[PDB]
Amino acid sequence: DCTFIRVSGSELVQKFIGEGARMVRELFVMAREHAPSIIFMDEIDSIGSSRLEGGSGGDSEVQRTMLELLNQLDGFEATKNIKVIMATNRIDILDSALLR
């Protein structure tokens, strides 16, 4: 029954919370209102988004959306009940090892 959250998110779920920022903190504030909570990466499971460059930076912040959250989960703040999920096939799975 723990609440569920996703990643971006278009287009218009962004400024709908706040105005402008790194924009992940407000999403990190959402989980403070409801815990336990489940956060997810929707989707970036595919081999097509790679492009080997042009999709990297697009994925980099999708990769960072976990990183800065992992840095705002483990790095500092608090406390428990918050989780994140990833999905891929290959490529970025090995690029996950770059992050891992």
């Binding site: 278009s10 287009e11 218009l12 929707d42």
Partner: protein, 70 residues
């Protein structure tokens, strides 16, 4: 922001079109020459479950488009 509101209206029509479920009535039929900017919630399960593309006319269709015009 007005258009953001009309794409919130697109969201508001995205919202209140699901009231068609169930029964009476609608046929939601869609067309685009470019699929780039279509949002995931526009192709959302329960919104677009069926995709028609443009099949290119070919020998049958040609001979059909050859016969139908003349």
């Amino acid at each position: 922001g007005a258009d953001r509101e009309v794409q919130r209206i697109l969201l508001e029509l995205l919202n209140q079109m699901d009231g068609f479920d169930q029964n009476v009535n609608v046929k939601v039929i869609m067309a685009t020459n470019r699929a780039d900017t279509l949002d995931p919630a526009l192709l959302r399960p329960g919104r677009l479950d069926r995709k028609i593309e443009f099949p290119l006319p070919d020998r049958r269709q040609k001979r059909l488009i050859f016969s139908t015009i003349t």
